[PDB]
Design a protein around this nucleic acid. Sequence first.
DNA 1: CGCGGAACGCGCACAGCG
DNA 2: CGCGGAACGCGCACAGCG
Lengths: 206, 204
Amino acid sequence: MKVPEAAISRLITYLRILEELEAQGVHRTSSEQLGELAQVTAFQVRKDLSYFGSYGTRGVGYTVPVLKRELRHILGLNRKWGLCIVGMGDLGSALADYPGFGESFELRGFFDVDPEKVGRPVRGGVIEHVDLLPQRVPGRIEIALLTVPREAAQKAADLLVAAGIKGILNFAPVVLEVPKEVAVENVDFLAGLTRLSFAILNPKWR
Amino acid sequence: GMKVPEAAISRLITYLRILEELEAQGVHRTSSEQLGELAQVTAFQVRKDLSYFGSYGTGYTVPVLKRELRHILGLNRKWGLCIVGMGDLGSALADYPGFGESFELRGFFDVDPEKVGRPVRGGVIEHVDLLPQRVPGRIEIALLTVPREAAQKAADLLVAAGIKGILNFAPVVLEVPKEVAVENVDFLAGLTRLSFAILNPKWR
DNA sequence: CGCGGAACGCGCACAGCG
DNA sequence: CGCGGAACGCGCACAGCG
């Protein structure tokens, strides 16, 4: 009912920690262990998980493959999302080649407008003009990796929204404007850099 | 409240960007309501985000704000950067043409024999074993882009070398001494955040 | 007229159950 | 015995003033 987004980010962290624990053969963990690895209090963990259910065992703890399964469900990773990359520049090309996507995310789109790229056969696929967006997105692409130069970002967004996209992972440094019907998440490395600058200059604060 | 919420610093970064665009458009005067509009926040928050540092208001001269903001964020100096992990991302970052005058790449490290010794925009790749010799006095921030499984270790090495801040791109929670700052850029996390958001539209 | 404190909404102790 | 509600604390109202 409450469900702060700060909690969704932490759930991501717990699932990753669970995958890792599983990889090490651990069968059972606890909020205390989980907190120690996610660098938060055990309270924060139990409270974050409580927003969705009671997956543990009182007096005992949490069975790793169970909670793991439960978090993947909540996070909507128990499905196979359709992805497309708009802006086959350098970052987008690195992305196309990222091997750590896993079962939950599948690349189906590849786009851009530059003639010198359009038509290049990328990893399992081929680039194409962003004009084919209206005829590519519906029912096959839900999420788009927006990676274009800061000035083409807002333009590319409109296009994507019109083509029926449901989510935009924005890599461009700028606040996008989209219908509130479309979810957007920013991945801003320059903002992070700037934050590091500030953090350094203000050690006390940090 | 003399203690600045960190969320306010994300907004200042956004304000600065909005100013640069203005200046670039030729505008000379802006307002609380104008900034908010462009930043999608209330004019209140803008004023509040600014009050933590001063009264730059008359008011609000784009160039006087752009300048005070970059001073507040520490962009008024030339930070030294290095990249640890020269794979696809490390390479992409190495050739990024938009750091600006505030961030300078002075190092590129790795362990792959095929990569070290390799020339790059701004220098050459060197083995991480050389960080203790390359960091002090020249490099404050490190762009960490190694595989997930080697992140912590690379981080342990940067710490040992005396690094001030790590911009972590690996999907892991780095463990570092308190005097070392860490900022994460997690796109897999954004992806999974979007996944959740799509399924919980009323939650929005 | 137009544009730099304080209230308010939201993010630990014990009850519950194995 | 061992490990899933409510207090606390962080993030609008008006005064000044051209």
